[PDB]
Structure formats: structure tokens, C-alpha cells
Amino acid sequence: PLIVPYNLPLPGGVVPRMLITILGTVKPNANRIALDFQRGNDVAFHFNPRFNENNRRVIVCNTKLDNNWGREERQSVFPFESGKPFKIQVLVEPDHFKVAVNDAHLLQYNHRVKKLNEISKLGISGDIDLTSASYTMI
Ligand SMILES: O=C(O)CO[C@@H]1[C@@H](n2cc(-c3cc(F)c(F)c(F)c3)nn2)[C@@H](O)[C@@H](CO)O[C@@H]1Sc1ccc(Cl)c(Cl)c1
Ligand SMILES: [Cl-]
Ligand code: NA
């Protein structure tokens, strides 16, 4: 087990064909999870499953610049289940982050923050038991 919130350093930032893998288990009756790919205090990519927003499950993605959230991108396809082990894979591509959960494509999120090599931290928070967070090149 890893303690949540957890910070995974991304030395020298991210780059296309870098794959970040997060393994854990959703807590029973979870409410929220977040991944925050950070450039200093800015959040280049916030990936935020919400288990009960007006009695619906939704994935909210966004960017935070100078402490201001931007336009949300929302996905109703929701692959997480309370109590179950999950794998989130975030693949950095030239124009977007691509996310797959449990080996099924979920979403893409276009790069708003363009200094990829300065996105040097991944924060992992919320209602999970975290087992592993790592990266490799494909
Ligand atoms: O404070 C509010 O009650 C909710 O805050 C969330 C905001 N958030 C979520 C979290 C958060 C924190 C945790 F420790 C977790 F474990 C976790 F899973 C999520 N921290 N900040 C963003 O998700 C943001 C994305 O646009 O959405 C809201 S803030 C917000 C509210 C309305 C609008 Cl229109 C916009 Cl663009 C942003
Ligand atoms: Cl939230
Ligand atoms: Na630098």
C-alpha cells in the first residue's frame, strides 16, 4: 500500500510515448478520485471521477492555471466500480493525453499546457487504496 494523497515525481516532465500506470482499488462507497498532472502549481491535466454528482457518475477533466479552473470536459462512460481493483493508464501523445482504464480506451484530453517537459509531478488523491504508480516508455 501507498499513502494517499501521493506524489509521483515525473523527472524532466512528460514526453510523447511516456505511459503512466496507476494501480489501486476503489474504496467501497467512494465519492471521488483525482489525478493531477502538475506544472508547478498549475494542473496541466486533472482527471476526476465523481461517483455521485446529482446521482450520476461522471468523469470530469480540466486544467488549472494561476489557481483558476478552465472549461470542463465531461465523459459519462464510467469504468470504475466501488470496491474493485483498477488500472489507469495515461499515455502522453503529441497533441493529447490518452486515458485507458482496465485496458479499455476511455478518453483523450488535448494539451492546454504546452511545456510538457515541465509537467514534473503526478498527484493522486481520493477514495482509493493505492498500490502502484510508475511510468515507462512504449
Ligand atoms: O470545491 C469543490 O466543491 C469542487 O472542486 C472541484 C475541483 N476539485 C476537485 C478536487 C478533489 C480534491 C481531492 F482531494 C480529491 F480526492 C478529489 F477526488 C478531487 N479538488 N478540486 C475540480 O474537480 C474542478 C474541475 O473543474 O471542479 C470543481 S471546482 C469548479 C466548480 C465549478 C466549475 Cl464551473 C469549475 Cl470549472 C470548477
Ligand atoms: Cl470532485
Ligand atoms: Na527546468
Side-chain angles (χ1 to χ4, degrees), residues 1-28 30-70 72-120 122-138:
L2 303 173
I3 297 171
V4 176
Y6 186 83
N7 283 132
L8 175 67
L10 311 170
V14 305
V15 63
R17 304 187 307 277
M18 186 175 176
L19 178 66
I20 303 100
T21 299
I22 306 100
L23 292 172
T25 298
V26 180
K27 287 181 172 291
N31 185 62
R32 62 185 184 167
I33 305 169
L35 295 184
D36 290 286
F37 291 86
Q38 295 220 25
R39 172 174 176 262
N41 183 64
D42 286 350
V43 184
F45 177 43
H46 176 80
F47 174 86
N48 173 216
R50 298 182 184 176
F51 290 73
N52 186 359
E53 184 188 70
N54 303 323
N55 301 298
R56 294 166 192 206
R57 309 195 297 165
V58 63
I59 314 289
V60 179
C61 296
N62 206 348
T63 293
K64 200 181 202 183
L65 299 174
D66 294 339
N67 251 28
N68 303 312
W69 290 112
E72 293 178 345
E73 300 182 24
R74 288 161 168 266
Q75 182 38 270
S76 294
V77 174
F78 193 94
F80 302 93
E81 297 291 331
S82 298
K84 300 197 197 187
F86 66 88
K87 178 173 68 184
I88 303 164
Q89 287 166 316
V90 182
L91 181 56
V92 184
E93 294 281 33
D95 279 338
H96 54 251
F97 298 93
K98 187 160 275 145
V99 182
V101 175
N102 304 336
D103 295 309
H105 177 65
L106 179 62
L107 62 81
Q108 308 171 352
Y109 184 89
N110 287 335
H111 296 304
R112 304 189 190 168
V113 173
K114 301 184 188 281
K115 288 175 178 172
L116 299 182
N117 71 358
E118 293 186 1
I119 302 173
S120 303
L122 170 60
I124 303 160
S125 56
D127 299 332
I128 64 173
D129 296 334
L130 180 63
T131 81
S132 180
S134 66
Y135 43 74
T136 197
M137 303 305 181
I138 70 169

